[PDB]
Every structure is written in C-alpha cells, then in structure tokens.
Amino acid sequence: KSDSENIKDVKLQLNYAYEIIPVDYTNCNIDYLTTHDFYIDISSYKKKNFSVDSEVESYITTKFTKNQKVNIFGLPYIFTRYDVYYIYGGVTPSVNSNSENSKIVGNLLIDGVQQKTLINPIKIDKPIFTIQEFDFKIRQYLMQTYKIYDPNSPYIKGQLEIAINGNKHESFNLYDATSSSTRSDIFKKYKDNKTINMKDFSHFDIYLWTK
Amino acid sequence: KSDSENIKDVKLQLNYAYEIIPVDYTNCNIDYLTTHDFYIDISSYKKKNFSVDSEVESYITTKFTKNQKVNIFGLPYIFTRYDVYYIYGGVTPSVNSNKIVGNLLIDGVQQKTLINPIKIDKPIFTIQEFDFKIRQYLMQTYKIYDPNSPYIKGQLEIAINGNKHESFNLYDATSSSTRSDIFKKYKDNKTINMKDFSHFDIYLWTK
C-alpha cells in the first residue's frame, strides 16, 4: 500500500527516542573506573546517594583517572529501581567554571541548497563537549523547527557534519534507526565518547534530503 | 495483517509518555501567577535563566502567592527552543520539614503484600509524583506498557486516612494520545499529605 511506510516508522522511533530529558551535571567526581564504565558521583545534586554509570567502548576510561572532575551530558537508555542513571559516554573533563559563551554557527542545506545560516540554534557552555551533547541538541532543534522526524515532513535522509580545525569533518546519519530500535540501540553509538574542544570547533552543516 | 492493534497502540503511547526523567526541583520561587499557570524560577539550579510553566485547572494558582516557595515534580509534555519546562500541576508548597506501602494483585491473585516499591521524601506530594513512580516501578518490573507483555488493564487505588479512597486507570490513553493528552489529568494538582497516606493497591489484568 506504500513505499515510504518504512521511513515513516523509522522516523517515529527516532522522534520518540530523542524526545527526552538528558542527564546533565557538571563538576562531578569520578569515584571509580572499570575497563568500560565510569562511576560518577552526583549525590551532592540529589541530596542522597546517587551516581551515574557511563558505559563506553574500550580504551576510553584509560584516558581518565579516579577523583578527576568531569561533566556529564548523556541520554538515559534505561531506568531501574536504583538511584543510578545509565548512559553511554557523555563524559568530559571539567576544566573550568563551565560557563563558556562561544558562538555556534552552522549551515542548513536541503537537497544540496543552502537554506539558512543558523546562529546559536543551540548552546553549549562547556569548553570541551561530547558529540552526544551537540547531536542531541541539534536534533531537538531540528525536530522542533523543521519536524525532521514527523511522518509528514519530506525529509527522509540527513546528515550532521561538524567541522573541526584540521579538515576533520565528523559526519553522522540523522535517520539512524530501524522501526524496532530502542533508545539503547540508538544511543549505543555514543559509547565512543567522541569529544570536541570548542576552540577547535569551526562550524556545522545540516544536510537534509527529500529524495 | 495486524492483531490486537488497539490495546498495543494504547500501551505504546503510555510507554512513550512515562519513560522520562521528571522535572524535579525543591524550594523554588513562584515568580508569577496567572489564572491557570504557575511561572516558577529554577535559574539557581540550571545556573542560567530558566523557568517552569505549570498549567493547571481553574482556581489552583489562587491557593498560592507570588514569591511563595514551592516544590516541583512534574512530567514534561512538550519541548521547545525556550529555556522553560512545560508541565501540568506537580506543584506543592515547600514546608519547614521537607512510609509508602501497598499490595499488588494480578488477575485477582495477590502477588506482593505490604511492599514499598517507591520513595517520596516530601511531607506533601502530588498524586502525579506518586502515580509516575508507581508506573515506573510497574514498567521496570512487569513491562506493563510493552506490547509483548500480557498486561492490558490496571487500576491504582490509593487509601487516605479518614477519607474516601481514589482509584486511577493505569491504561488511560487512546491510540492517538500525546503526552499532553495523557498528562492533562495532572492539571488538577491533586495533593496528599504523607501523614494522611494509608496504603495503595495495584490491580493488573491480562483479561
């Protein structure tokens, strides 16, 4: 009865996955490090014992050390009866007051043609941030503004490209899911804990396609 | 070639709606009050200008006053580009101060007796907070809103000392219900004093 039914279901899974409140805490202590998990304390914020378990890919926790202060910006993929938030990656070194006021500019292209230059569509206050934080915020902006995950929008393909000084153009599929994808499935990509220093950030490009 | 689509679609809307981190803040200043909205400041928490707009039914904000301190526990129903959380109800007075037990029955057979599946530390709390925590307990433990679970009907009954108990439908959604549709019930800002809370009873059915 249709040839676009699948992309609609894919968009539905993405719209649901990203319509969420992130785990956002700054200047938190790394209580313990395992081969693939960060165990971070956020008890001071909660006023009761509470931690965050950030699961990552190999050789990421080795970049950190116990009792180092870090910032957390991760999307929860599951909830349990315990006072612990479960996220993938989203961990960066906290190196200052975390009150950066840097300008974020980007280009929005649809079907290969520039539509507008986005000025501060999103805001990031930390000097070092994860692509997860940038990705979440930009998708939310796109969801709210261009309805990119609405079944009635013409967008069925899209990429987010982040330009970093040194020809490093990170590129991510904006329609990265199947009709069966859970938040865990969709967020697993963030286990690489990919991080960018705002000072190395040049701009970003959003490529949306209708065919 | 789809079977039992309805109940599954209803469960899906609910599963989507309740799988969220709530707007939870304590000792917040009421910056402004309109006929149906509370505009509460949470900037000190967000380390940036940020507010919460709690929409409620008539004559609820009239029970509060500008600059009174309140606690917030509400479920966001929409996200926008602005630094404002949008919820229904979830507002209680912050008190100088600042024992949940019940049973669980499935298809008439009591499975859990006198359990404390959730925790609320406020001496006064909204039924919204209680309801959210109970549903998360049920979603986590029994996957009550997963289309592949057998639970298709349910009631959450709350007993209050010296008062009539109240019962709430746990599958209160249609196949086209948004988060706003499902959370609209919380606009009554129904609240309970912990000291008056007696116990609860959860009933689930597969038939």
From TrEMBL, chain B:
This is Exotoxin J. SUPFAM superfamilies: Bacterial enterotoxins, Superantigen toxins, C-terminal domain. GO terms for molecular function: metal ion binding; toxin activity. Residues 99-204 form the Staphylococcal/Streptococcal toxin beta-grasp domain. The keyword rRNA processing does not apply. It comes from the Bacteria. Belongs to the staphylococcal/streptococcal toxin family. It comes from Streptococcus pyogenes. Residues 14-92 form the Staphylococcal/Streptococcal toxin OB-fold domain. Zn(2+) binds at H165, H199, D201. Pfam families: Stap_Strp_tox_C, Stap_Strp_toxin. Keywords: Metal-binding, Signal, Toxin, Virulence, Zinc. GO terms for cellular component: extracellular region.
